[PDB]
């Protein structure tokens, strides 16, 4: 409907709100050492995502200012609707090395280990911090994330960034789950924005985990992973099938007839994905998924080059994604895919008001 | 409108309504039998029919033989038909297979260099094409990735190009798009509906010269790269001064509405519309049908945003050539860059069902 989803609240919006049908995520390192620069870059990126989450255009508009001056905002967005923008903050370990805040680096933000089969591009891995702009309209969050780098220029630099066509993942069990490039529906088993209760367990940081300023927010895993098209589009439909455990046309477990039907784990090859990463194989480990699906041009050798933008949060990276991507060193899916860019951010919690500001908990004031 | 029709006297996708995303591919062959690209043409076609139909191509994405791959990779299954059109062209470089080289139009023009081209041959040229534009972009990137799929062996992809323009779910269908330097673009360009102009500007007749080609139309490519950063410090009279209208609504230097006829002498003399406006190019007029790009950050942490232009024309030696050329002292050039580019001869339509991509060029 092209409505707005509320910027403030005890959360970031983003995470358990439903997933929109595009993404732009940025990645960005910090370049002044200036704590109090920082600060007011801070609170001059809240003010421009309240009017770009209301759909209104950033500082004095796009027009109609000083002929002499640049416009305040560049314009692309003109005449849009909010679109479901939603812009979600996050800070990567590299920044706790700034600004004297080296004690306030959380335990729960854990480095990931390095995973078997991995080939991570540097450049397109980690970051100080990051901002995750998804909408249903792609002008609309190039835009945003466009206007937030104009207006860090000098005091931020966008490291890397990455565009997600469509979605691969469901906070809304309610509607229809999207499907990969690989031709599966992805996000039936995820956790929903209205699962009160599992958010609490598995997504929302609590003050008794150790880290105060953290209450409220959650820790992000970034994962840019190809996809092996050309070799997964020579499998079997019964090997395709086997590689996750569920079926391809309804995407039923095996032997079900239905979508949302529980799985039955032990009917499904040891080596399968589900079987592999279901929260009872991971002694109760749960993700929130909320990944999309990209494209990158060609390989410059005849073939389509696409893949998976996968994006996981959870109240603990040790205790999410960590243990699960371990237990997938076997999933027969890892012929069929490689992980390629890599980062981990710790989200903070919500903006609660007009007065509040991108990471008050953290900075204080 | 959920679909748009795939028979025609011509393709669909040139004079049919703009829709809201595209995957354009350029593809290479990669097989010396004109038999056999015979034989995949109809099998394109086949699956063309079922893909703009919201159909999964051959006999489905599930339910066959556990043992065989599937005909369809799956990813458009419960996707609408989106309004996708998918248009074939025929780049020049097709013609020196087969033993076409005698039947290459001489309207289908290999572009001269332009001052400022930065053109990367990666990205570049192509023996066909095929243009994809739909509401949703997974179903074309679907239908391209099903396309390659059949083709394999006798084709491959060159380069592949994603873009986009209004969202027509929360975006009136009569307002102009606006492009990634905030302007509204598309206010004067030829529309669908405006039958006597599209013969005179965007269909090739029989007389022409080429008589295969007749109904179909030619096309000019070019990726161009907007320089983001650089235009959004200029002041927002420069921005105005380099098009030649203002930035708000869109009207012509000394007019209020958008929509107003330009007086061109109002303009500075090189204002981008001054310069490729018809009355400045002896008449050459363009049919405009291009999509914005934002590939990511290049390595310098700049956007890698822009114009994936594309333009139809009867001859492209009467159309892109000559206002291309007016461009050489456009104030634009400052903001932008082009660096891919390819022409390609779209062939007339797919009349029936027992039509095929190619027919008029290849024979019955
Ligand atoms: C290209 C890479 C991947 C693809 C194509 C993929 C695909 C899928 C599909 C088709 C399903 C079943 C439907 C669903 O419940 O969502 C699924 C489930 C799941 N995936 Fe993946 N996945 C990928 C990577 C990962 C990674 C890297 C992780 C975690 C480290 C992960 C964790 C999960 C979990 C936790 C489930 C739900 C299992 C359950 O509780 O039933 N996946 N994935
Ligand atoms: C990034 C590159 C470009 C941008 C941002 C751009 C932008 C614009 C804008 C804002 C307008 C005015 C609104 C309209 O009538 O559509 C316009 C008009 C036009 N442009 Fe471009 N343009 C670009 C490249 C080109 C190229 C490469 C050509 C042809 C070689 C071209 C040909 C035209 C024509 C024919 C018009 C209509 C002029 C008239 O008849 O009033 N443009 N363009």
Redesign the interface.
Known sequence: ??SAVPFHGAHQAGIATPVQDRL?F?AFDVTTEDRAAFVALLKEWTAAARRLTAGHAVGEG??????????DD???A????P?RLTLTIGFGPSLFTRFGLADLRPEALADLPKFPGDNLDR?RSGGDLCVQACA????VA?HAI?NL??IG?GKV???????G??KTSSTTPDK?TP??????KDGTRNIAGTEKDRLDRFVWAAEKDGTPWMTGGSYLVARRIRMH??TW??????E?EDVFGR???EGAPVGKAKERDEPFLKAMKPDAHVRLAHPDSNGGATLLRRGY?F?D??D?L???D?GLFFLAYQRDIRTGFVPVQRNLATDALNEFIQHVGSAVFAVPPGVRDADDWWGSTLFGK
């Open positions: 409907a092209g732009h940025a796009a027009y109609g200012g000083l002929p002499e001056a640049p416009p560049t314009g692309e003109l005449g849009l609707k679109s450049a249903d309209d792609p002008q190039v466009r780098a104009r220029f630099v966008v490291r890397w960034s990455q565009l066509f469509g229809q499907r990969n490039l690989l031709g599966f098209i050309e589009d020579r499998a079997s439909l019964q395709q079926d391809k046309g699906s494209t041009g060609t410059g005849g073939r389509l696409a």
